[PDB]
Amino acid sequence: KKAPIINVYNHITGKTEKMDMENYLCGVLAGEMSSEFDIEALKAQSVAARTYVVYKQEHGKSSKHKNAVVCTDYKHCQEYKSYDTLKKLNGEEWIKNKYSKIQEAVRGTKGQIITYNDKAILPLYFSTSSGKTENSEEVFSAKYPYLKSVESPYDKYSPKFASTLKISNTDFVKSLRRAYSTIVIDVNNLSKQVSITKRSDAGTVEKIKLGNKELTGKDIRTVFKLNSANFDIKFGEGYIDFVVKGYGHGVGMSQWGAEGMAEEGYKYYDILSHYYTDTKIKDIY
Ligand SMILES: CC(=O)N[C@@H]1[C@@H](O)[C@H](O[C@@H]2O[C@H](CO)[C@@H](O[C@@H]3O[C@H](CO)[C@@H](O)[C@H](O)[C@H]3NC(C)=O)[C@H](O)[C@H]2NC(C)=O)[C@@H](CO)O[C@H]1O
Numbered sequence: 023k024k025a026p027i028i029n030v031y032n033h034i035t036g037k038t039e040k041m042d043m044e045n046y047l048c049g050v051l052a053g054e055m056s057s058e059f060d061i062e063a064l065k066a067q068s069v070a071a072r073t074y075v076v077y078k079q080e081h082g083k084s085s086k087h088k089n090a091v092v093c094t095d096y097k098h099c100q101e102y103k104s105y106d107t108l109k110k111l112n113g114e115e116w117i118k119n120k121y122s123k124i125q126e127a128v129r130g131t132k133g134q135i136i137t138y139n140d141k142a143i144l145p146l147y148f149s150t151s152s153g154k155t156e157n158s159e160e161v162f163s164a165k166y167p168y169l170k171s172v173e174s175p176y177d178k179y180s181p182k183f184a185s186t187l188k189i190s191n192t193d194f195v196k197s198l199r200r201a202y203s204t205i206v207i208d209v210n211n212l213s214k215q216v217s218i219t220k221r222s223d224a225g226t227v228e229k230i231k232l233g234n235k236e237l238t239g240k241d242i243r244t245v246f247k248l249n250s251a252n253f254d255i256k257f258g259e260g261y262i263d264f265v266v267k268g269y270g271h272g273v274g275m276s277q278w279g280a281e282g283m284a285e286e287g288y289k290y291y292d293i294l295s296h297y298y299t300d301t302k303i304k305d306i307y
């Protein structure tokens with residue numbers, strides 16, 4: 023049969039809209055990747071995005087949006103940019119010359135999903151790793167045979183591979199106190215009170231001690247708007263520097279990694295089987 027119609031929760035308007043898969047995936051790709059990425063990277067992303075929807079259909083309904091399979095918020099499911107949005111933001115020439123490449127990538131992989139033992143997988147993906155992807159359980163909760171840590175040697179060419187942020191000691195404690203009212207921390211000798219308790223081999227900070235509090239790397243990323251939870255802290259006179267690696271949760275497929283592999287000659291099946299361990303590709307329509 024033809025492309026299914028899905029229920030998408032638009033987090034901005036607050037309404038559930040019906041959309042055709044293909045048209046929806048064009049919007050996902052437009053927001054997740056640049057039209058300037060290699061066709062093989064875009065194709066890999068389109069398969070993951072499609073697989074994400076299929077995976078959610080087969081599993082339990084979400085707490086956030088129970089009437090919708092996926093939503094338009096990259097913080098919950100994946101990014102989305104409608105045709106009108108992109109038209110007003112980029113123009114008619116862009117739609118005809120660049121967006122066309124996105125549509126071609128989506129139709130290029132029509133009905134294709136990533137599978138583990140013939141079922142659709144949870145195809146998590148993110149911008150840039152630190153050099154290795156993360157095992158699902160070390161970042162989230164559960165262990166999956168296909169979300170394992172693998173090398174990602176082209177990530178170092180990403181503009182988002184490294185970043186640093188300086189925060190005064192004062193603002194460091196002020197931000198923590200505003201977010202955690204029970205925190206007992208002193209602006210002097212932060213180096214004696216702040217320390218990383220547990221970190222994965224890939225580098226995601228799982229636990230970090232701040233005074234009397236134990237937070238996760240994600241918690242820190244959130245409070246200070248860092249690109250990732252893979253960071254180290256260096257204490258200076260009057261400030262702290264966060265030295266961050268990568269951008270995004272680090273599990274599954276690296277978008278800049280895929281771009282790097284594609285630039286080196288790899289095709290979308292090999293990109294997808296490299297990041298999603300022991301998987302295959304299946305055409306469901
Ligand atoms: C394409 C992509 O990677 N999108 C990202 C989202 O997947 C991600 O949402 C978070 O996803 C993980 C994995 O699905 C969720 O973890 C699950 O949490 C539940 C309950 O807490 C637990 O039962 C599951 O075992 C656990 N899954 C795993 C694999 O361990 C997590 O709850 C989602 N977070 C939120 C806030 O909804 C978001 C946010 O990280 O980013 C997208 O880019």
Ligand SMILES: CC(=O)N[C@@H]1[C@@H](O)[C@H](O[C@@H]2O[C@H](CO)[C@@H](O[C@@H]3O[C@H](CO)[C@@H](O)[C@H](O)[C@H]3NC(C)=O)[C@H](O)[C@H]2NC(C)=O)[C@@H](CO)O[C@H]1O
Pocket residue numbers: 053054055056057096101112148149150182270277278
């Ligand atoms: C006309 C034109 O293309 N102008 C450029 C903009 O497209 C560009 O916007 C940014 O594009 C990138 C895609 O490479 C977006 O990155 C993605 O962001 C989402 C979260 O929204 C995240 O899930 C993805 O991991 C991430 N992808 C990658 C590969 O890192 C980024 O959000 C876009 N920002 C926007 C739309 O505000 C800007 C960026 O400066 O440059 C124009 O020249």
Ligand SMILES: [Cl-]
Pocket residue numbers: 025043044047072128131132133
């Ligand atoms: Cl499709």
Ligand code: NA
Pocket residue numbers: 131132133134305306307
């Ligand atoms: Na197909």
Ligand SMILES: [Zn+2]
Pocket residue numbers: 084086087092093094095098099100
């Ligand atoms: Zn969602």
